[PDB]
């Protein structure tokens, strides 16, 4: 229901502040480190570069994040790695490369087996934010290889996706139809056919309904992903906090069984406007 709302947030830019400080706010239950956005056929060991934060181009190594990640997890926050994003050049390449990449993610990000870009860690999940890939092929293969690895080691990491709000999604529909994601974060912004606007919840309500019908199983596995300010959604979609709580959430069909909470793009925007602070007050 509404009171059990969990909040997620994207993190990975200079203006976001430190990861540790983001967790210690205690506003969030999930944080996406964003993004791993360059990989494809000839890139056997993908590197992480966070703009103005860490990477070979910044002169500060991303492995300094290891202790902050661990502090977050200790205080009950789940830390995901997000693939893809609005920028970069990414592709799953082929059925063979999809196996290579799934093994790479498991060895270096999910099991503490070796030292990787974020140091020696075991993250809580992998998040498919496939907004603008080279093409739509092989994303289902990547998902299915990670799912299989989970069975082999009896691991507990989670798998999630962030499709656009118009079903069926151009890039992730085959993957979503496997029924093997744990969570779906539907992006209700930058699309006039399915987002909120002042005095009209009919299009977002209908789109929520379409997603409850086409996503199985029928668990609490659906989040709304929304912009945390007007500035991070030049295509529209921003919902003021009082309108979210009062005019939108009470009127989503099957809220009781399907709704898991909200995700905010992004941490910088959230700091600037107090979005999640005002939501938490009205819970």
Numbering used by the authors: 1 to 283
What does the paper say about this structure?
Our results demonstrate that MHz XFELs can be used to collect high-quality serial femtosecond crystallography data, and that under the conditions used in the current experiment, shock waves caused by the interaction between the sample jet and the XFEL pulses do not compromise the data to a measurable extent. We demonstrate here that it is possible to separate the data of the three types of protein crystals in such a microcrystalline mixture of jack bean proteins (urease, concanavalin A and B), and to determine the structures of the two concanavalins, using data collected at the first MHz XFEL. Therefore, now that the first MHz XFEL has become available, we investigated this issue at current EuXFEL operating parameters, using microcrystals of the model protein lysozyme.
To this end, we collected SFX data of a microcrystalline mixture of jack bean proteins, crystallized using acetone as published previously. In contrast to the concanavalin A and B microcrystals, which diffracted strongly, urease microcrystals diffracted only to low resolution and with low signal-to-noise ratio, and no structure was refined. Indeed, the electron density maps are of excellent quality and the overall structures are virtually identical to those determined using macroscopic crystals, with core RMSDs on Cα atoms against reference structures of 0.31 Å for concanavalin A (vs. PDB entry 1JBC30) and 0.24 Å for concanavalin B (vs. PDB entry 1CNV31). Given the lysozyme results, it appears unlikely that our jack bean protein data are compromised by radiation damage or by shock wave effects in the current experiment. Moreover, in just one shift (12 h) of data collection, ~77,000 indexed images were collected of concanavalin A and ~24,000 of concanavalin B, despite this being one of the very first experiments at a new facility.
